Structures are given as structure tokens and as C-alpha cells.
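Section 4.2 – Deliverable D4.2 (structural model, holo form)

The reporting period included a commitment to supply a predicted holo structure for the target in complex with adenosine-5'-diphosphate. Inputs used:
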Amino acid sequence: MNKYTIAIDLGYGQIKGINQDNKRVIFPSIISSGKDRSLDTFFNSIDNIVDNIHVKILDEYFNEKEYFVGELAKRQPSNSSFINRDNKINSEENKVLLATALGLLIPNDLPNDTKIHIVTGLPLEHFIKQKQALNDMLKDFEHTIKFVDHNFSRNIKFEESNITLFPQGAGAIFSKINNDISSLLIKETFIGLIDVGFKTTDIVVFRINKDKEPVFEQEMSATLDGLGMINIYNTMDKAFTDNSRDGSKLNTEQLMLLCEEGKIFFKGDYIDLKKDLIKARKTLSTNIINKADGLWGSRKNSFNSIMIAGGGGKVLYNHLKLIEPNMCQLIDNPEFANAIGYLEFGKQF
Amino acid sequence: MNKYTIAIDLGYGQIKGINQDNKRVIFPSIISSGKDRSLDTFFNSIDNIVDNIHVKILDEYFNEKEYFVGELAKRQPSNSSFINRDNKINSEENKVLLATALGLLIPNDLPNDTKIHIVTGLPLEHFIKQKQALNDMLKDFEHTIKFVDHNFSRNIKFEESNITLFPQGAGAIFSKINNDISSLLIKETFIGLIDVGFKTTDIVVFRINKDKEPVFEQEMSATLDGLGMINIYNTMDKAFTDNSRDGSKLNTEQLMLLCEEGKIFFKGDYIDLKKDLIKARKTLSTNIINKADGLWGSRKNSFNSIMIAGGGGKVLYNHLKLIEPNMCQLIDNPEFANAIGYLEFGKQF
Amino acid sequence: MNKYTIAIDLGYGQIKGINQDNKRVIFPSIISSGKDRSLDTFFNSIDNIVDNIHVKILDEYFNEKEYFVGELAKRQPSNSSFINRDNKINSEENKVLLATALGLLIPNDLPNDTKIHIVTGLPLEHFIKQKQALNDMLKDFEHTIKFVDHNFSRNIKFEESNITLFPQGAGAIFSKINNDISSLLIKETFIGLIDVGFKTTDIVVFRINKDKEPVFEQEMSATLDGLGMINIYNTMDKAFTDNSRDGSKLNTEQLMLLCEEGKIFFKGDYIDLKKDLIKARKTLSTNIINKADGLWGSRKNSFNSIMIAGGGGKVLYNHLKLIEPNMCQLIDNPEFANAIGYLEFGKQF
Ligand SMILES: Nc1ncnc2c1ncn2[C@@H]1O[C@H](COP(=O)(O)OP(=O)(O)O)[C@@H](O)[C@H]1O
Ligand SMILES: Nc1ncnc2c1ncn2[C@@H]1O[C@H](COP(=O)(O)OP(=O)(O)O)[C@@H](O)[C@H]1O
Ligand SMILES: Nc1ncnc2c1ncn2[C@@H]1O[C@H](COP(=O)(O)OP(=O)(O)O)[C@@H](O)[C@H]1O
Ligand SMILES: [Mg+2]
Ligand SMILES: [Mg+2]
Ligand SMILES: [Mg+2]
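Output (C-alpha cells):
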């Protein structure tokens, strides 16, 4: 029996994942306290399970705890922090989003021989430091998820020879383009992978050799600390205080709505803030281009094709084309590049 | 033939109802017992049928009891207590007020196979608490009504899959404005209905989505149970006992005459209580605004059009404009918002 | 002058004490030898006096014995028994624990002729059997205690008519909730309080009368000797030695850490005993289900609230929910449940 495989992304913009059977889930990194949903059931019947994940979690002593999670969490004004959310990998906030995307992707009642090979991700510089905090976490991981309003459960438990760790964007450029990168790579060319995340952006590059195989360069690749979408949400936060001049603060929902579209329905009116949206997209891309050439000296002329990824890279792409025009390009799925890049690369074993 | 529909509200200021054929009747929720009326029939023959509803109602054991009900029972001193009466839905005072609203709206020649889809309702916090008690009541509602001085007898009995249980304020804004409010709602706003009634104030809100479709907020919407127009009838009679200086109390007719005008006829004189009436209509409006704003934080700036309804919401519209000026609005029928909202949203069955 | 209030508990697991001004202490009930602490001062800060309890005790005949007690004594390998500690309530061990309890709670700058009223704890059967043994030893008390490395002594003396005696589980529901649950208690129910102590578990119920006052049932309430947290340390003792397969015994310290973690670090390795530790609490959870219904026939259905107490029940609340799910509930401070009741109900004088 071929043991199952689930690859998930432990991001902070939105939690991404995909199973062995190519079903993929996506939801923001937002939790909230769960409460009993019976009245709104009669109003709006829940068909999208992902939109309204109402969920209970058991543990080693059945210490039951319910959660509004996902879009259901984002509907709450009592939701997660999301502006100073936990960077510790062993937080319960990380435990919620990890266990939730399991039962979204585990098919019902798998055989016990067919256990699940989970392949997860870390930040590039933080792959070494927070490895044992997550290696201990995944080995200790033994719970029972309960789906409220959808009513199917998993006794989630994982061990070694099933848990698998890779940095952010490890097998995204090695595999999944593995038959198409062979035309790209010739001899001593430099491929580039840029995952524009929420908190940090990882620029990860491989060096191909005389034997046409990519070797890793930890000196041309690092974690751009504090550079991502979190600057754009912070900058557009101050633009609302500058335009409305009320001192009012947008919530978690309105500020994410602001940098998604540019127009917030404030006091019956669309406060138009579209001007500093694309200006922040240029300024973030300018921060990326300038910090691209920090690690990159004259080796930028050794490029064959740069790939970009991340949810931020999908909306930056025209201004993020200004790294290397007509050579840098977008990956097939900007969000899900790490997802299948952990999955088929995790299906190697 | 086709099964009929009669949409009535179990109102405690006045019973609000309208049938499938768009005939509507309305009467205060006051019952008495009944005695045969032939003396005043010679003086005042019944021109207004609703003004003088003497009613005889058989039951499943055919143990009939006579009842003065409505404006007639308001003219009776032997009427129900009605100001400290419970809102228990299977009580004897509710079987009379429901059936009296039936036979005024029941058209002639309804066969027994064309069972009336009575669209009943429960308040917003009471649609979970008091749902099975009306399932207790409507299953038990097996009676036979007879009108006095008009004399057409309707065999009143209702079963499951004919009866209908929507929340109060649910279909009043999900339907009945659904073709018009969608022109006003575009993106992630909150539409809301506040039914300021007699005992309860149903503040019910929806959240619309990107697709201009409302999802229900069960945490920004609640019933202000015990907060309504019954506090104004409570407040102003206390000011009259110190103004009359006899210690006497206005009864179930004169107290309704008191806060509706401000000046009660006492011993050849209309004793004035105009000053504290506006104070009663600000203090009630003080805790419909601020009690909604306990559920309405900074998402109140994302509101588009707050609707208000109810007979109390009809008469607070100057003071209840102070929820948010030039954003709040009154529905065209403050009485028949819920009843047509029962009816229009009861057309789906 | 005024006579102050200090409430302590003679819990065999850990002594739990509080003054009138709500400054409360907690430390395990283990003593050891007191030796010269000079060198440990220079390396590490002796800041928390609860962490570093080096104690000299003068007698009234001044024999001047010296003790490590509690947390520092827990780190001593030559400590007290604590798994077969003697049940003599008049022991010097109990005195040293009580003198340490009084020392951290008697404040400085207390006026000259002030004294303290003190409240103790007794098992509910042993409050009458073992009454005068403790009630003479508290009268016997006149000692001077010295806290090393903090430089303040306490000459502590008590007489008759200042000590006060109430048994275990008394004040936690007779007071401390009497202002709150009196809204909840109506007529002829029983409230529940389950103190999950270290050695003995406490079952106590109060009948409420018609007039909303608590009254006591001696045959619906008992003291569970031999039932409590102490069975779990006995169970996990052999559970390690059988799993060590060497006869290697944990110390007194790792014994306490074992039922707090289940993963003891041993010979450079985590010995995981999570299997038996889940079973042992459920073994204790089973043995309180049966003793509950031993005192509760159909009178279990005559409940309106069940509380639980004891430091063990804090990690057993969801696991002792199996008797009455959501009819049972949790006290605020499961350690300090008896003491705050002894604080509040001890304020009769
Ligand atoms: N359609 C979109 N419009 C605007 N921003 C988007 C869109 N899609 C994704 N994003 C941004 O991308 C981020 C998602 O990044 P993601 O690839 O999940 O990285 P991470 O792994 O760090 O979470 C979100 O925080 C969001 O701001
Ligand atoms: N013209 C009016 N003047 C004063 N008060 C009115 C008037 N019309 C209605 N009301 C008040 O509104 C209440 C009716 O509320 P209603 O919408 O029937 O709510 P409910 O469903 O709780 O009975 C009455 O009790 C009455 O005090
Ligand atoms: N955090 C914790 N983890 C595990 N066990 C605990 C914890 N806190 C308290 N306990 C257990 O509870 C006991 C304390 O019980 P306590 O309320 O002091 O009762 P007593 O009055 O009999 O001493 C300890 O022996 C300990 O085993
Ligand atoms: Mg990422
Ligand atoms: Mg109403
Ligand atoms: Mg105790």
C-alpha cells in the first residue's frame, strides 16, 4: 500500500496546501474563537466547507476546543492578530492551522497502513533554527479533529519516516518544472526563485554546474527579513489616517480589503486610496530589486530565467518584472508554488 | 387545489398579519372572555368588524369558550392583564389572537386539502429558544372558530409541512427589498433591520459579500428582549400617579391612550404628560442605539443602510434617526414589514 | 487592636495560603535539612522567596532547628517522605510547613497589639474525629521563624479564641459564590463541589431550601480517602521501573515532573510514558464517577450546578466532565479554592 502524502504551506499571508491527489486548499492565517452556529444555518446553508470551517479539536486528554477558522475567522472582529502574529513555530495558533488543513485534505477513513507523508516548510534562514521546534512538534502531534456542521473526523497522528522538512521554495524550482528546466539550464546559469510572502520574502537561487545539476548557494540566497506584504498593509494603514483624519483604525477585514482593491466603504462612502496602492507595489518591488543586488554582484548577468512565487508576486508581477525584463517570469501557480513544490518533490520518496 | 398561505406576526403591541391574497388586518393583542352582545347591537350595529370581534372558539373536545378580542377587548375592563403577561407561545392568550387573525384573513371556500401555509415567526434570540414551543403549539392547534354577529365558522387546524417557521426580521430584509437593496449594497457592507416593538426589539443584521449576497451575522445581531415600548407604558403612568394625586392607575385602554398622545382624560380634563413622553422616547432610544453599538464596533463605518421597523420604530423615527443620520431609514410599512416579510419570503413554499 | 485574617490549607500536596490583603503563596509540602547558603547567592539572584525558602526556626525553649522547605527542599535529594509522609497532624513537619505558611503572609509594618485570626482545613470526616488534635496544637503554637537571605524574622504566637476551624470544601461554596449562585439556585436543588486533592478527594453538596439558603447533607457527601492524585504518582512509579527494565527509580523531583509532562529526560534520552499517564488519570477519572453515584442516586438529577476544585482537577476538568457534561463547571482557582473560602467565610470575626 502506497502511503499517502499531504504537502502544506505554513505561511502568514494565507495557509496553502495540496494532498497527494491534487486537491488543494487555501485560507488566510486567521483564527477565532468558535461559537454555536445554529441560527445562521437557517439563513445561509453552508456549502463551501472551506469558507465556514467550524471545527473542534481534541488532544491527549480530550481537552476540547472549538474554533472559527479561515474565512469564518475573518468574519469575526474577535479574530487573530495578523499584524504581530506568532513567529514561534510551536504556537497553538500554528497548531490550529496545521491540523485544520489536514482534515480538509485527508479522504475519509484511509487504511491504517496508508499513513500520510506530511511535507512542510520553513523560512530559508529559519529552516535550521526552528527545525527541532517543529521536528518535536510533528512527532508529538496526536489529536482528533472534529468538524462541526460537516461531521467527519480524523484521528490525526504523525511520526518520523512520514514527517518531511524543506525550506521555502526547495523543490519548487527543482521539480514541477523538472522537464522544462532542462531546456533552461545549460552550464553555470543561475535560476532564481522569489517567494513574495506576507512577513518575509525568500530569494532562493540554485547554481547549475558542468554536470547540469542544480547545487545550492546559501550566499546568493537569503531571507529578506521584514519585506513582504506586511509593509503595504502598514503603509496603507497610515494613508487611511491621513485621508479620513478621524483617528479611526480599520479592522483585520477592512485593511486586507484595502490593499486588495483600494477602496474601503467608510461611513457610507468609498474612501479612494488607490493612489498609494500601486505606489506601494512599486516601492516594495524597488525594495526587492535593491535587495536582489545585495546578494547578486555581477552574477545577475549569469541568469537564464528568474522565477517568482508567493501571493504577493502575483500582484507585483508587472512592477516585479523590473528585476530582469523578458527573462524573469511568473511560476504556474504563484501561491501554490511551494505547495506542489513540496508535494511532487515530496512524492520523490 | 392550491394550498393557501396566511402570514401573521405574534405581536404584543398589535397582531400584524396578511394573507396570500394581500388582504391585511391588524388589531391590538388584547383578549377578554365573551358574552352575547344584543343590547349594544341595537345601539351600535357592527359596521367595523375588527372593532367589535366577539368570538366563540370550539376546541378538539368541542368545549367552546366565548371571547371578546382586540379593540373590543380593549374597550372591556375585564380583559387580559397583558402588561405582565408572559410571551409563552402555547398559552391560551395566543390561541385566540392567532385564530382571530386567521378568520379575518381566511377567504371563503377553502377546502380541507388546501391547507393554509401559515407563516409564523419567532424573535431573533427566540428562534432557537422558542422554536419547539411553537412546534408544540401548532401541532396542538386543533380548534373550531365561530365569529359572533357575522357567523361563519372556520375549522382551524394545522399540521407539520404546512406550518412555516422563519425568524422575525429574516424575510423582511432578505426578501421584500431584495430587488431594491441590491442596488444599494455593493461590497462587504452590513444591511440591518431593527424592529422596535412592544416588548422586544429585534436588531437583525446581515453581511453582504463580494457577490452582493447577504450572509447572516449572529454576533452583531440580537433581540433586545424586555427593551421596547412596554418600558414607555411603564414609565409614564408612574408620572401620572404623582400628577393625579389619587394613587389610581390607568387601565389597559387608558395606558395605551397615554403614551400614544401624552394627555390622558382624567375627571373632565386632559392631564398633560408631554414632557416626560419625549424623555421616554429618548431614553428608550438611548438604549437601542447604544445597545446596538455594543454589537457594532468599528464595522459600523462599513454600514450602508440601517432599516428600522415596528410600531415603536414608527414612533421613534426622530429619536431613532440618531443611530446614524442620513444612513438609517424607515421601512414603508413599519407594522407590515415582518408580515409581508413573512409573506413574500413565505411564497417560496 | 484589630485582628487580621490569614487563611491557609494543610494540603499534603502543597500548602496553599492567603492573607486578608489577598497576597497568596503556594509551595509543595516537603521539608528538608537547612544548610549554609552563601555560595548560591553570588551566582544566582535570591529574588523569589517562594523559590528559595531557607528557614531557621526558634522554639519557645529555643532549640533552633534549620530547614529547607518546599521548592528548594524539592531540589534536595535528601528531602521529606511525601509519598508516605506521616498523617500525624501534630507533627513537627506540619508545624514547619505551617510556620513557613505564616511567615510569608504576616506582613511587615503591622501595628503593635494587632493579631491574626487564622482558618485551617480538615477532611470532612476528620473534622470531627481529628478535631481536637489539631485544635490543641494550634493553641500550642509559639515559635520564632527566621527567613535566611531576606533578613526578617517572625515571632508567631496563637491562643484560643483566635484560631478558627472549618473543614475542606466548606467556604468555597458557602462563601465566594453565595453572592453569585444565589441568582442561580432557586428551590430544592443540590450544588456540587469536588475537591480533587493530592491524597484525599472531597465530595460535598449543599441542599438549598425553599428560602434560597444552603443546608448540608452528611450522607450525600464524603471524604475519599485513598482516592486522588497520589494514586497517579504511585501508578507512574511502577510504570517507569517496568519501562526502564532496570529498576531505575526516579527521584522525588522527576516524579512530580512526570505527571506534569509524561516525557522525563533520562540517561540522555526522553523516556515517554504518555500511554500510562493517559490511563492513570482516566483511572482516577473512573474512580470518582463511581463514588459520585455512590452518594447520588436519582438525586444526581436534582442538581443545578456541579463545581470541581483541587489542584489536580484543573487538569481533570474536561476529563471529569464525564459525570455531568455542561452541568459540571470549574472554579476559578482550583488550588486556591479552599483558601479564598477560608478567607471570605473566615471573616465572621
Ligand atoms: N488577489 C490578491 N490581491 C491582493 N493581494 C493578494 C492577492 N492574492 C494574494 N495576495 C497577497 O499575498 C499574500 C499571500 O502570500 P503567500 O504566497 O501565502 O505567502 P506566505 O507563504 O508568506 O503566506 C497575502 O497576504 C495577500 O496580501
Ligand atoms: N400611532 C402610534 N402611536 C404611538 N405608539 C404606537 C403607534 N403605532 C404603534 N405604536 C406602538 O408600537 C407598538 C406595536 O409594535 P409592533 O410593531 O406590533 O411590535 P410587536 O411585534 O412586538 O407587537 C405598540 O405597542 C404601540 O405602543
Ligand atoms: N499544572 C499541574 N500539572 C499537573 N498536576 C498538577 C498541576 N497543578 C497541580 N497539580 C496536582 O494537584 C495537586 C495539588 O492539589 P491541592 O489542590 O494542593 O490539594 P491538597 O489540598 O490535597 O494538597 C498536586 O499534587 C499536583 O499533582
Ligand atoms: Mg511563502
Ligand atoms: Mg415585532
Ligand atoms: Mg485540598
